[PDB]
Design a protein around this ligand. Sequence first.
Ligand SMILES: O=c1ccn([C@@H]2O[C@H](COP(=O)(O)NP(=O)(O)OP(=O)(O)O)[C@@H](O)[C@H]2O)c(=O)[nH]1
Ligand SMILES: [Mg+2]
Ligand SMILES: [Mg+2]
Lengths: 249, 744, 25, 708
Amino acid sequence: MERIKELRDLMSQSRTREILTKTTVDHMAIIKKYTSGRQEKNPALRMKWMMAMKYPITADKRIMEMIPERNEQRQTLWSKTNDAGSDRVMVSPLAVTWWNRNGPTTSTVHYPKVYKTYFEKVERLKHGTFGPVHFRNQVKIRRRVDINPGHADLSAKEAQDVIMEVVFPNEVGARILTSESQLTITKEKKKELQDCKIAPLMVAYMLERELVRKTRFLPVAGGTSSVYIEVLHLTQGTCWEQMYTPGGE
Amino acid sequence: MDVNPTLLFLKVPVQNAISTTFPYTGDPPYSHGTGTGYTMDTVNRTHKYSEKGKWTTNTETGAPQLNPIDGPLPEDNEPSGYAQTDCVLEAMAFLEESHPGIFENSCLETMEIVQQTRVDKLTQGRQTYDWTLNRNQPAATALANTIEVFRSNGLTANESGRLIDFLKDVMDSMDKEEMEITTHFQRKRRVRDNMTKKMVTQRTIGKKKQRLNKRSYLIRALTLNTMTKDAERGKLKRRAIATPGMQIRGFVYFVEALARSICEKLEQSGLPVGGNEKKAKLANVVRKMMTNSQDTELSFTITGDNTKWNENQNPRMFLAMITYITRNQPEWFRNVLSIAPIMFSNKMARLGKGYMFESKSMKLRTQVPAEMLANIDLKYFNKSTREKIEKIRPLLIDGTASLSPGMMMGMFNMLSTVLGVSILNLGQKKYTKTTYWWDGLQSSDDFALIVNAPNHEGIQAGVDRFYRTCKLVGINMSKKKSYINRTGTFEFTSFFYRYGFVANFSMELPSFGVSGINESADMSVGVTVIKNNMINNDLGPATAQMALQLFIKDYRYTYRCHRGDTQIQTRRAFELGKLWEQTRSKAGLLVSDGGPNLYNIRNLHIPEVCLKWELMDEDYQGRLCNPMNPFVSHKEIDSVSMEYDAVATTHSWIPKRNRSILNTSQRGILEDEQMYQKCCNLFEKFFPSSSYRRPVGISSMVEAMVSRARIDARIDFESGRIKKEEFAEIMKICSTIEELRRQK
Amino acid sequence: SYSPTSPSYSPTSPSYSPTSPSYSP
Amino acid sequence: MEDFVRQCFNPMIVELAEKAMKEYGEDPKIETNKFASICTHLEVCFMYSDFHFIDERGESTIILKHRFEIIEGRDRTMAWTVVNSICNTTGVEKPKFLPDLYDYKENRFIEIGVTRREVHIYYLEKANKIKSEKTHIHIFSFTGEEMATKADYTLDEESRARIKTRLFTIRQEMASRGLWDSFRQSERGEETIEERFEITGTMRRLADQSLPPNFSSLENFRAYVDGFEPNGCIEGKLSQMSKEVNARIEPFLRTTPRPLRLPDGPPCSQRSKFLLMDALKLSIEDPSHEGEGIPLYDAIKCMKTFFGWKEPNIIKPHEKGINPNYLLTWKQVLAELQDIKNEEKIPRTKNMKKTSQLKWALGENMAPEKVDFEDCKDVNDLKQYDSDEPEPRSLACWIQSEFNKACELTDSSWVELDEIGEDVAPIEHIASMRRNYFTAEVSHCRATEYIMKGVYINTALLNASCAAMDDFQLIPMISKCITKEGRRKTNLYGFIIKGRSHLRNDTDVVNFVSMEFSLTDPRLEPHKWEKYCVLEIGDMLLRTAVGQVSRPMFLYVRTNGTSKIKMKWGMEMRRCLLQSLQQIESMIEAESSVKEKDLTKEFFENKSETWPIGESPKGVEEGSIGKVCRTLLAKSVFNSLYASPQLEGFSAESRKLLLIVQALRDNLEPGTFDLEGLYEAIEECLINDPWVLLNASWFNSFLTHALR
RNA sequence: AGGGGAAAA
RNA sequence: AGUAGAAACAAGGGUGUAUUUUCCCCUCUUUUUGCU
Ligand SMILES: O=c1ccn([C@@H]2O[C@H](COP(=O)(O)NP(=O)(O)OP(=O)(O)O)[C@@H](O)[C@H]2O)c(=O)[nH]1
Ligand SMILES: [Mg+2]
Ligand SMILES: [Mg+2]
């Protein structure tokens, strides 16, 4: 209803009618990346010399309704912009700090849910036990280990298919889920993610983190399991070995 | 006492302290002015290594072309591009014989890749030459301009998403009697600046219509733009690099895919593997060669680089190799794979910006473009440039130099590596017919060659045989940069092996610092960089802690997020102090909020937010991770003005970006970008999964959107989420949209 | 606890610090 | 036959068929039979679906909810998403292959096939192909025969009659033109897509011109290659090859290598952006004044702490410059400082009047005006820019002294590292103690003072350049340290005046003028100060061990320039520390593995282990681990300060010689091919840079001491 | 899936 | 003058970062300068 009215309005014009009618779905990928402005180089230097400016941030105009123009110490937080389409406003880090110290507070936050893997890593590190450090000659073998265990039953392709089925049921295409474990995980995630208030893309990335398996070639000396690879920087050295036991099972 | 760091090498081996030989803490060299001089120099050098070839005049482009294939065999050790076709074919045949079925399987994989490859793949490239505008543009912009020009001229096979269809369109375009293009034109206006009260030439850029005859379009299609390589370490003098046009990138891509498939099945190839994979491969090869060597046998390793590698590789030899590889294959596959060498054998190099001339008497300076250098008196140029222009004049047409020989700075890395690996494979006992033999590894042009022979004279004979064979195929070993010693220590692609690869931490120094994305992103990048350097480059624990401290200090200064309980004063100091005093659990605040640094070697692998989540204050935690942060973009709900909740913290804001030109107006060109973005946003609204994965389909935008709207309305009505009136209204709107589409 | 020290450090030869001397009257 | 199809079927059907075929790179011009087949199939599907609706009651009606949903004639993605939506909503099974219609009333997918041969064979083929007893099959024939699954013809007799009549009409019309034979015989191979890619026209001519000399056509070359077999081609060509082409190994004995040949010319001069060993700083102790933190306030206080200013006068003039301009610049700086001190609320930053002396010193209006070549084609005296090579310079002895000073131990701490998390793991505790040793060793090094000075100066310069681009700004040179007593101290080295900084390219240079205090008389080493103009600005009363001594205090004034890249890499000078520490730790680690214990305390405290790090008239000199750490830090800092293409090239081309020498020391029988060429390449990089010349001299000394 | 950063050839 | 080096800046379009490989991070568009 809203989208179709927007499409009608957008096709009412002349140039946009040509763009929509003379462009195929494939060519979208080409025109979406289309740009004609100057290219930016050395982002680090730009940040270095821009953080000294008054307003190095750009925010949606809605921020005007939330963050006051100035704080108690008369320090301006945002200023109206001229070189814009009236959808962006300049902002200072003072605005970020003001929101963090005085912004609206809520008891519902999605960070723990969207990043369950990192919290699992934190829990594993918290309950781990440390043994003695041995100064001995260390022999390292460059081999392919995993960094993200993913789901043991599902492979990379199976995990991707399950993710697409769970997040975008009507866009899977010709693909079909065959493995029984695939179907079970799909059902479990559909039940768990039902009525989710997060964007589908970020839910898909969450599922990718939770399910897909990633392997890298690293110099390892000792364990190979993912719980040990995540702590390789700490349990292994050129001439020292730090005995460790992750808190996980 | 006169301190001399080099004397430290008396005790510690050079390899173990090799990090001290890399001056990577200083700014790398940069090119200042034009790259025309380097392009002319490389063209002349390429044409001098082949001067004993055959000269012809192209019947299509009307440009001189030099063919050194099957030229006289070199009499001295100077670089020579006179490769012998029979020798290359024999090397390929022996490579195929040593690895039966390699070419057939590679061709099967390449056919599968070719049939399923989409045109948008070409957008993966960086800046590319654009013949429509005759200048460098982003790959996506160049591809869009080329597609628009082809469509306007009646070539519409690109309407299908397949890349092979785009190649067919390019071939068809190469036959048209004339091409109608839309280029950019300039309008200048003298205006007084209101801040400095000086006259300046305000510039306005617009679109026009131009017509290119057959020859002009052909020259533009075979052109490669040239510039100077910047920020390159280890070289006193700069060198030129090339960017091909949109018409050459697809064929080159397919050829490179075939070469990569071939290289994957080659234990002597240093590509496409890299990093730890390449180090493991090199160590395995060295250990296998050393073990297979008998106790009496003498093994010698030579570290070698090749002189003017790209200038001595002929596209004709690449064509011969491709023809041999694709034997007993469908004709269409052979044609599509062999097109790229054909294009490169007739390529033209664009000189570049031009030169700068100075009239001191009148106190003026001007930029002479390349197109004018052909019709300028030689008295203006200096001796070096005068000689360059005099030597290059016969090859100059339309501001471009004809360059038949050479592969132009790494355009066929994989194919060149394949040729080198074939030469290496020619070293087995079954081919040398002598007590000596050789093996090793090759990457692009660098190589490590291990020769085993009973005695020293055998080693010398093997080295001479390998050198002569390389010269026969067209590869010139660099004697001044290569050396040979007993096996056990060597160097390869800045990897120093001394009975095992040694760490070289200097090369990773530039990665340390603040990436300037945002607060949380920079913190994650820095911490993960420290962790990865600890894992890989043998960074010590104490050194890792010191690096963490330095990074925290730099980050705090960059983002003005000093500790709350600090006397430093700045714009952000007041808010940070207020927040510090307000909160109770002072350890829960992020570093960007003036909180303490809780990081250490233990938890270098944990994101900052999750690291101190349990220590965060309830109110502070809610404020920081509010679902409605104004600094992060929000998405409208799909199939519903409520927006999706946000989980990104307030520290993931978007910094301001500026893309303005000095005294230039481009409002006529950014409109297209704005409308394209609007249409893409609308389509994403219609198709929720478009962003997650690139969609495909030959149907038009509006057609797909209307079809999806109709099916969605029907399905919603069937399920019961909408009543009759809404379905009727949606159907009516779809019908009127379709009617408007049909009748513009 | 650890104070760096060098055998090349002369306690008297550098009579005054030419880079960072004391000049307050 | 294509024109027949165009004139027969409806335009929408024709364009749908054209799109469907072009979706797979099939040209309707040459694939006319498949074009007609697809057009007929689309027409049959549309006729089957049309004129069948569903009333609100839920029964099929023929004249609103359409009875049938089309899936044919759409995109692959469009059709598949329609199928997926239908399956998700109604819950029917997902077909393995794309069907042609969906019946809501019957709630199932239907495949519609049109054939020229017998119906039964095609029905068996389709039933075997789909192999699923849930999708209806309906086959029509141009002869008037029709069949379905289980004899369930969902469509009414009338609609099927219309379909059959239309098919017969098409058959008769086609047969009138005698095109039916090919159409019927081609059905066998209509399911295979033949890829086509041909080289013709200009491309064929280009191909014919891209072959070896003795070939005239691409086809001839392909024929030759296809039948090619290897018969001693390489061996025969090698036998013909002249024996003067060879790779003869020349042994690298202990008497082969020779010292590098440094260039000749006038002695090299200082080129650092600030003084290193001759710097003098005016310091304030425990700064607690109002406005502390602002550089200008601290600079004013530091200047106030010193009494003894006199009338400045030229002592060492700049040969190529206008010294009165430098004198006026210093006087103007003093006057501006006085004026800013007169006011109450000193501004955060101070701009300087664009006087003649500053205009000349900062090179304002020195560039020729840029003009497009189109408007200057009539100019008659245009000459190309100069590209002369750098003038060679000889190696002077001041650079070695500068390095020696940089390697020394200072009394005041120069870096205050931030805190980190609590140590829990034993390895973390070991790292903490090792880091305590490293920080103590490195925080009291002159190279650290240089690092901090350069970082602050570059940060201030870039901030001023980007914030104020058309103004002459005054930037005091400030540093912070902690004395032996643990009390903070703020030092001022001098002042920098920044010129216009309209920097567009990364290599664009902003010019500035640096005035630095010093106690070093320029007349002792005049060649070192060719670029400087040195004044006598004061008399300083220093406290010595025995008493107090009055000495002149000079102001080294010069014009320098810096680019955005130079400032960027100047800011990241703390990285130098890592380059040293990572090495030092590694060395310690290399020993610990041998001794199975941590040797940090023994190395730093007992100083049992020493490394050759210096040279003295006696011979080679050994230093402890701390001395080596400081030397490596100084080397990294000087690499950062004196960076240039010469240094990069020299390091790259001398690494090979170092490795060859190491191989000789390893008894690996090293051998070379063109060692003279390597020496020439190394020497090509020694032109004028003092740092590179010092490195070359160091390499010569190392060769001398390693050959024996 | 895309973008950015670093290294080497 | 100075930076700098094979050609440029010293204001008046930034129209000059390419191919391959490897590693790492992220998920969108429309009046200031303080490293205690
Ligand atoms: O920046 C680069 C570096 C290397 N390469 C590609 O890698 C090849 C080898 O790069 P190289 O470093 O060996 N230089 P080369 O061309 O051999 O000349 P020389 O120094 O005299 O021995 C080159 O010929 C290019 O094809 C690039 O394309 N760009
Ligand atoms: Mg080379
Ligand atoms: Mg090389």
